Amino acid sequence: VVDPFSKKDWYDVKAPAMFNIRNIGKTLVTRTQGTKIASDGLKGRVFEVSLADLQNDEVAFRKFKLITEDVQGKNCLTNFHGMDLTRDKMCSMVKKWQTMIEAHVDVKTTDGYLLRLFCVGFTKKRNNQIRKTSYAQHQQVRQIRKKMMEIMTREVQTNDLKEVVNKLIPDSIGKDIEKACQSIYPLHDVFVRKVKMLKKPKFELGKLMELHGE
Amino acid sequence: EQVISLGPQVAEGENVFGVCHIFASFNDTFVHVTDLSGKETICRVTGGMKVKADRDESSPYAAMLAAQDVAQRCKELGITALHIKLRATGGNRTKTPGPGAQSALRALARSGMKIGRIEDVTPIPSDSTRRKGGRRGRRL
Amino acid sequence: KFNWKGTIKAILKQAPDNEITIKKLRKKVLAQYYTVTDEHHRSEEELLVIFNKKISKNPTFKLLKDKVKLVK
Amino acid sequence: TKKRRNNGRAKKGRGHVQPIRCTNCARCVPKDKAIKKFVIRNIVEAAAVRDISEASVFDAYVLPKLYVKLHYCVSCAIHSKVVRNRSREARKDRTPPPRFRP
Amino acid sequence: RVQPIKLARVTKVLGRTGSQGQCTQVRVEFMDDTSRSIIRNVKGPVREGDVLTLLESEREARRL
RNA sequence: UAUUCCCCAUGAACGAGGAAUUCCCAGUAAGUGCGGGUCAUAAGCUUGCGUUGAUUAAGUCCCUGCCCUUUGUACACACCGCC
RNA sequence: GUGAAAUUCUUGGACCGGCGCAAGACGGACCAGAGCGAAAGCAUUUGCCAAGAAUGUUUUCAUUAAUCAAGAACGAAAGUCGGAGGUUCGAAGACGAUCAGAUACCGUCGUAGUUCCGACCAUAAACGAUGCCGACUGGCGAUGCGGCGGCGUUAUUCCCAUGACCCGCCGGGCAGCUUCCGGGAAACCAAAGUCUUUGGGUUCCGGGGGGAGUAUGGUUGCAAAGCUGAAACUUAAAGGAAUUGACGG
Ligand SMILES: [Mg+2]
Ligand SMILES: [Mg+2]
Ligand SMILES: [Mg+2]
Ligand SMILES: [Mg+2]
Ligand SMILES: [Mg+2]
Ligand SMILES: [Mg+2]
Ligand SMILES: [Mg+2]
Ligand SMILES: [Mg+2]
Ligand SMILES: [Zn+2]
């Protein structure tokens, strides 16, 4: 009979300490009653947040996933869950008369956060070029792809999630790939397209406090 | 305003956000509004909730009326700003949003709501799952 | 069902020298058709071509270049 | 008689091209024969740009574009007036229509 | 519940429409926020420079 | 089987018209009479004339058609075609 | 969902939003008058297996060649047989509409099939509606592969290479524009030219329209059917390409 919004109380969602804008926003949930709890129905929510809403001066077409992991009263503490580009940016880069090279690698950080990183890069027209198309041959595409996979593997394989996300914030990996592949075929729109989480160990709460603390 | 139980206890200058999933297809429009996660629904008004003619559920006027009702309800629940997630039918079928995206987004803005990020979330397949018309299509 | 050949033969019987102009015959046949019929989908042009097939394509009738004559 | 030198399609050095589905009737068209069209229209529909701009919470926000690629069969392209019949010497003209810039 | 009655002043006429040439497009401006201006369909002889009344203000008019 | 007219009686339908459909934009439509033709006898017809005098519109190609260009055609008695 | 609706699903909570899980398909945008393949055909990454054209070559053999009845390999889709699998579509079928009717077009559901493995079938507007091999006869700009040669720009790196671009040349390709080469009934075609000034080599194949790719015999196939294939009789035109009109929902 009664409206259900009198049975709800508002919580606050906190980003980790990689970002300087700590407060994401406000989520709500029904108050605990019976056998269903507020906290277990609150965990596992996913907040796709833009990067410009977490960093005050970074780009807007990159966005982060930030699953919630624990509840500290009126606060929902989140941890990194994935990264993606916006739809319009990805649709804006893909155009005709050039070759698109994509690569993906499955790879585990030091603390057991097995990821899947997707990369993308496009062949670049020279400034004095008068031919219409800029097409890499198949062997050039294959060794560019090989360089992409080896760079992503060496960048995330020897780190853990904190500085891996700190690499993903300015996308230094894409700049490394673009710098490395200039001797095969010059690429210009090189990004890490998408980061996917495949496995997480055991939820050490002290680690989540370290991420949310200093 | 204020209830004060319904609505978050916030300051007076800063604003609280929601997500407005606008499914504007042909034959209908949806002005669903959720919280930031998308798991909690605040309000949902569709175009067919406002007209009783069954051919203009996708008309811009019905989308405007749905957007106004959604804006009033979300305003009395304390939500003041919205991120927009525009959507067509997509997948196998058309990728152009329907006739009701126009007036729904305009009416949300003109009803006194702050607009955040706008994004397209139409489902795009990587060439999957054969469409229905037969091989010769629909011979209207 | 309207009977085309029987109505045309009946009109040609009630005529001087079993002889009638095509226009008068067409007028009387179409008036008869409209006053006895039960079917309504047929158009004016379909009725006209049906009448032309009825008069020009019958062995009992002859066309004296603007008229219809009953042969014996 | 043979109407066009290409047979209505861009198939020169191959036997078979993969079919696609027409975007508004779902007819199977060969990919080289289809009338393709790329649309980079604005989401926010510039007749209504100022209301969205003044209602925005940011100060400098650039509106996203919408990127759809359309494929038409010949019948749908004619009926939706994407293309039109032309005379013979006008038929063999391959230039795109002018961009009506001013 | 409805937005109030709005008065609108007619800027240049945009031609005839309505499949019998019965309506015109007018590009009115709202004379309260004069910067705000929309296209509208009017029946009757219009004569740009005069004032309309709009019961439902923000509908649209499709561009000819 | 009343030419027309006059007088006294008689006092019928008709209460604004279904589906359809005609004509018309300014001294116009409509109302209203008056001449001419026909005429021995004679206008509910027509052809002219004044008189009173508007509503709506200055558009479109939707319906019915016309003109011009490109286009298709197995029609040329020409789509009421051919089959 | 449609022109409009209804069949259909829905407070036993559909549709919408979130997080997951599973299944089988299919590989978008990039993707082109681009490539490869005898055709049919071929597009997610990586690895393995054998193959191939072109190019380069002051390498070998030395006429070993071209086209080919009989014979042989492959051959889209649909179809058949057996075994897996069945997401989506969807012949048959049912229903809802529309209609004078509506065993249709439109809508809802849905069998066989669509997918994989193994075995058949041998047909397509299987088309460039154009046999293959060779020679000669205009121009131009591009493009793909290989090679050669040049001012400069760019990358590592500071140099010589090697890549990205720029300017050309040669060879083999897919094509384009232009031309009173010439041809052609013309449309058009640089091949459909080098043809009464008629002969480079060779295979298949047509002889007015129908009957008819039918009958019959043979032969292949599980079948469906494929291949080979008449005659009686009938008929004065059937066709091609252009022109003018008329008509065009
Ligand atoms: Mg509905
Ligand atoms: Mg049609
Ligand atoms: Mg033709
Ligand atoms: Mg083929
Ligand atoms: Mg097959
Ligand atoms: Mg179905
Ligand atoms: Mg099969
Ligand atoms: Mg013969
Ligand atoms: Zn179509």
UniProtKB/Swiss-Prot annotation, chain A:
<dbReference type="GO" id="GO:0022627">
    <property type="term" value="C:cytosolic small ribosomal subunit"/>
</dbReference>
<dbReference type="GO" id="GO:0005925">
    <property type="term" value="C:focal adhesion"/>
</dbReference>
<comment type="similarity">
    <text>Belongs to the eukaryotic ribosomal protein eS1 family.</text>
</comment>
<keyword id="KW-1017">Isopeptide bond</keyword>
<dbReference type="GO" id="GO:0070062">
    <property type="term" value="C:extracellular exosome"/>
</dbReference>
<dbReference type="GO" id="GO:0005634">
    <property type="term" value="C:nucleus"/>
</dbReference>
<keyword id="KW-0013">ADP-ribosylation</keyword>
<dbReference type="GO" id="GO:0005654">
    <property type="term" value="C:nucleoplasm"/>
</dbReference>
<dbReference type="GO" id="GO:0006413">
    <property type="term" value="P:translational initiation"/>
</dbReference>
<dbReference type="GO" id="GO:0030154">
    <property type="term" value="P:cell differentiation"/>
</dbReference>
<dbReference type="GO" id="GO:0022626">
    <property type="term" value="C:cytosolic ribosome"/>
</dbReference>
<keyword id="KW-0689">Ribosomal protein</keyword>
UniProtKB/Swiss-Prot annotation, chain C:
<protein>
    <recommendedName>
        <fullName>Cell growth-regulating nucleolar protein</fullName>
    </recommendedName>
</protein>
<comment type="subunit">
    <text>Interacts with PRMT5; this interaction is direct. Interacts with GNL2 and RPL23A. Interacts with nucleolin/NCL; this interaction is direct. Interacts with phosphorylated IRF3; this interaction impairs IRF3 DNA-binding activity.</text>
</comment>
<comment type="function">
    <text>Plays a role in the maintenance of the appropriate processing of 47S/45S pre-rRNA to 32S/30S pre-rRNAs and their subsequent processing to produce 18S and 28S rRNAs. Also acts at the level of transcription regulation. Along with PRMT5, binds the gamma-globin (HBG1/HBG2) promoter and represses its expression. In neuroblastoma cells, may also repress the expression of oxidative stress genes, including CHAC1, HMOX1, SLC7A11, ULBP1 and SNORD41 that encodes a small nucleolar RNA. Preferentially binds to a DNA motif containing 5'-GGTTAT-3'.</text>
</comment>
Swiss-Prot record, chain D:
<dbReference type="Pfam" id="PF01283">
    <property type="entry name" value="Ribosomal_S26e"/>
</dbReference>
<dbReference type="GO" id="GO:0005840">
    <property type="term" value="C:ribosome"/>
</dbReference>
<comment type="function">
    <text>Component of the small ribosomal subunit. The ribosome is a large ribonucleoprotein complex responsible for the synthesis of proteins in the cell.</text>
</comment>
<dbReference type="InterPro" id="IPR000892">
    <property type="entry name" value="Ribosomal_eS26"/>
</dbReference>
<keyword id="KW-1024">Diamond-Blackfan anemia</keyword>
<feature type="modified residue" description="Phosphoserine">
    <location>
        <position position="53"/>
    </location>
</feature>
<keyword id="KW-0963">Cytoplasm</keyword>
<keyword id="KW-0225">Disease variant</keyword>
<dbReference type="GO" id="GO:0022627">
    <property type="term" value="C:cytosolic small ribosomal subunit"/>
</dbReference>
<keyword id="KW-0689">Ribosomal protein</keyword>
<feature type="compositionally biased region" description="Basic and acidic residues">
    <location>
        <begin position="86"/>
        <end position="96"/>
    </location>
</feature>
<comment type="subunit">
    <text>Component of the 40S small ribosomal subunit.</text>
</comment>
Swiss-Prot record, chain E:
<dbReference type="GO" id="GO:0022627">
    <property type="term" value="C:cytosolic small ribosomal subunit"/>
</dbReference>
<dbReference type="GO" id="GO:0042274">
    <property type="term" value="P:ribosomal small subunit biogenesis"/>
</dbReference>
<dbReference type="GO" id="GO:0000028">
    <property type="term" value="P:ribosomal small subunit assembly"/>
</dbReference>
<dbReference type="GO" id="GO:0006364">
    <property type="term" value="P:rRNA processing"/>
</dbReference>
<dbReference type="GO" id="GO:0030490">
    <property type="term" value="P:maturation of SSU-rRNA"/>
</dbReference>
<keyword id="KW-0963">Cytoplasm</keyword>
<protein>
    <recommendedName>
        <fullName>Small ribosomal subunit protein eS28</fullName>
    </recommendedName>
</protein>
<dbReference type="GO" id="GO:0005840">
    <property type="term" value="C:ribosome"/>
</dbReference>
<keyword id="KW-0689">Ribosomal protein</keyword>
<dbReference type="GO" id="GO:0098556">
    <property type="term" value="C:cytoplasmic side of rough endoplasmic reticulum membrane"/>
</dbReference>
<feature type="modified residue" description="Phosphoserine">
    <location>
        <position position="37"/>
    </location>
</feature>
<dbReference type="GO" id="GO:0005654">
    <property type="term" value="C:nucleoplasm"/>
</dbReference>
